[PDB]
């Protein structure tokens, strides 16, 4: 109910979830989905299947706005990462490209204990 056609797909992978957000040609959320959005509570969300279901949920809700092409942006190193991508390609949407933009500091804030023990 706003027709967009082409846009961007943001895959936010991690070890506890995979949340996907579909944006217009310049960053505005049209629809989104996540492991929890599809039903899985707790650890289930982190599974790659959830990822797939989530990426698909997003796509289906996407095309509702007449979406057809997407540029994918992946942030994170979770498990769903690769599955979510697979999902989109096979969703019907055209994956115009894929770019990994995971944020990484040039050393800034002291990480929490669980992420240290590092050198």
């Amino acid at each position: 109910k706003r027709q967009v056609a082409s846009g961007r797909a943001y895959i936010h992978a991690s070890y506890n979830n995979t949340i996907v957000t579909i944006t217009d040609p310049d960053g505005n959320p049209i629809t989104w989905s996540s492991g929890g959005v599809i039903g899985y509570k707790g650890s289930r969300k982190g599974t790659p299947y959830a990822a797939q279901l989530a990426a698909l949920d997003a796509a289906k809700k996407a095309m509702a706005y007449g979406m057809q092409s997407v540029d994918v942006i992946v942030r994170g190193t979770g498990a769903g990462r690769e599955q979510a991508i697979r999902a989109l390609q096979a969703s019907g949407l055209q994956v115009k490209s894929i770019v990994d933009d995971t944020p990484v500091p040039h050393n800034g804030c002291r990480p929490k204990k669980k992420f240290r023990k590092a050198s």
């Binding site: 899985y40 289930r44 599974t47 790659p48 299947y49 959830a50 498990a79």
Partner: protein
Amino acid sequence: ARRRRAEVRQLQPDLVYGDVLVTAFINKIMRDGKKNLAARIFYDACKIIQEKTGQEPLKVFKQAVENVKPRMEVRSRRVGGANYQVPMEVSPRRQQSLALRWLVQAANQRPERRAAVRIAHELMDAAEGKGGAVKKKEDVERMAEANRAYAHYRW
């Protein structure tokens, strides 16, 4: 089987249809090595499916089996303090095994007093797409799939 991979016993073709799959089914029916009693039961059933049906018993057989084979099943596994029903594809050799076993199992659950009748009905009833044998087969597939989330644990 820690060393080799155990080769499958090759069975002797059926005394009547010259089919190996029949000998198997017979074997599964058999209990306490009464292969005679077994064989007869299957055969009488063949003649029962021959009557109440116009189709050939041998073909009815094949079908049922084919209908009761599971193509997916969940195999339990241990992963960091937890057991998971991991969906797994099902080996052809194991399918035939589970199919034949199930038919007989289901068959003897039936109400009809006479053995052969129970096999007879269950068998034909199976090729029809119904019957407890097929329900088991379906529950198994429903079990698998329904745990596709734990599918990445390929095993």
